[PDB]
Structure 1
Amino acid sequence: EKEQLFLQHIQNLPQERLDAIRGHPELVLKEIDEFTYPDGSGVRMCIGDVKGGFIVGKIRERKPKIMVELGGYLGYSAILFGNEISKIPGGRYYSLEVNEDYAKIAYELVKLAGLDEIVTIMIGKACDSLVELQQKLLHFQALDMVFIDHWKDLYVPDLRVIESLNMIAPGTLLVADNIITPGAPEYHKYVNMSPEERRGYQAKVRNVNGFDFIGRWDLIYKTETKEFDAVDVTECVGYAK
């Protein structure tokens, strides 16, 4: 709706502006950042300068070959992080977006930014796309980096899907947005739980995504909260006894 207005804006840009920004990720991000709706508001879910720079720093430091985003909206994150992923040989970025309308817009922006061969947008429920992605990757076991910024109540349910799919291993980094506002106490709690506390959590809390996505309790997590507005930075550092 409101999102279609932004797409229309991009599509009705002068040929000279499209030519100037095509294939240039930072320039495309700037067009998204500078757009204003009739009511004066901006495009939602643009990643801020400092936080973006923080997550980019992590990508540059750890050089994930496979980065997955739970969420995606209109392509901002996929363009910012996918651009860094494009610097890494073999790098792929997967954006798992449930709203099909949004994903169609993010696709156009990702394409305009020149990131189409690197960035795949998977449409549908995150847990379904994770199952599909794992199976596709099998035909290497774990994800290198996961960016989590969709609906707060699916943070733990989807993480448990990833764990159950064995896509978390030592070296895997989880970066979860909006921990404080509004934000996501349950996820913050889960990744700070010991392996035994999570053993019991999993037996007690049914996963809404499906019963057999129980999770994996024997993963050792080390979590740090960065404030700017806060993100949880969780590294899998080992397996429990």
Structure 2
Amino acid sequence: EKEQLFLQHIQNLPQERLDAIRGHPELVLKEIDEFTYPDGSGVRMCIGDVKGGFIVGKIRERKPKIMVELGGYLGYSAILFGNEISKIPGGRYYSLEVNEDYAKIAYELVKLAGLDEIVTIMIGKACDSLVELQQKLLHQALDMVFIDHWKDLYVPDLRVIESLNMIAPGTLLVADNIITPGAPEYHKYVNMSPEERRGYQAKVRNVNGFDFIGRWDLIYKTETKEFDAVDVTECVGYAK
């Protein structure tokens, strides 16, 4: 819709401009940041400079080899963090986006950024794509996960990740918009003890399916970082 206007803008840039920014993630991000729609507004829902910088710091510190984001929109975070993943040998970035129209646009921006060999966009519901990703990785656990899609799916999709044994000691979770609009359920979940999560999981049906009850035997450590806020959750071991 609106998003097609943005894609048209990029595709209609002069060749000299495309040649100038091609293969330069930071420059492609700036073209996204500086675009204005006819009504005067900008591209929405992008992770942005300040939160983005914080997360970039975590990636440089922890050097995740496998990073997954839930919710890609037009490719901004995939480009920002995929660029960081580039610097890490063997590193791969997976973006799980439900809207095919959005994903197609993100695919072009990611390619223009020079990140096509590093970033893979999976189209479909995150819960479905995670099942498929697990099949592809068995050939195991995720190193870092950026959770940035619909707030009501934070805990259901996290429980899917848990159930697929994609969370292990060393795995870091970064969840966006903890305050605005808010994800209180998620914030509650990742601050729960293993025993608390065991009861929650038995009590609260995963809307994604009975088979995705989750894994309570994970020890979590969570810090909220305020800027709005993001929750930073590390699995630090398996629970007794």
Deviations 1:5-45 (A, max 9, x none): 00000010011110000000000000000000000000012
TM-score normalised by length of structure 2: 0.99
How far did residue 218 of structure 1 move? 0.7
**Residue matched to 2:95:** 95
Where do residues 101-112 of structure 1 align in structure 2 (5 Å cutoff)? 101-112=101-112
How far did residue 239 of structure 1 move? 1.2
CA RMSD of aligned residues (A): 0.6
Deviations 1:155-207 (A, max 9, x none): 00000000000000010000000000111000000000010111010001111
How far did residue 47 of structure 1 move? 2.3
Name stretches of at least 5 consecutive residues in structure 2 with no aligned partner: none
How far did residue 49 of structure 1 move? 1.6
How far did residue 65 of structure 1 move? 0.3
How far did residue 109 of structure 1 move? 0.1
SS in 2 for 1:17: helix
Output the CA distance in 1 between the equivalents of 2:49 and 2:23.
21
Deviations 1:206-227 (A, max 9, x none): 1111110000001010000000
How far did residue 46 of structure 1 move? 2.3
Deviations 1:44-103 (A, max 9, x none): 122222211110000000000000000000000000000000000000000000000000
CA contact (8 A) 1:148 1:155 kept: yes
Output the CA distance in 2 between the equivalents of 1:92 and 1:40.
36
Output the CA distance in 1 between the equivalents of 2:73 and 2:143.
22
Runs (4 or more) in structure 1 with deviation over 4 Å come to: none
> Number of residues paired by the alignment?
240
Output the CA distance in 2 between the equivalents of 1:47 and 1:10.
20
CA contact (8 A) 1:75 1:107 kept: yes
Output the CA distance in 2 between the equivalents of 1:171 and 1:103.
29
Output the CA distance in 2 between the equivalents of 1:215 and 1:149.
19
**Residue matched to 1:13:** 13
Output the CA distance in 2 between the equivalents of 1:214 and 1:117.
34
Output the CA distance in 2 between the equivalents of 1:156 and 1:46.
21
Amino-acid identity (%): 100
CA contact (8 A) 1:45 1:76 kept: no
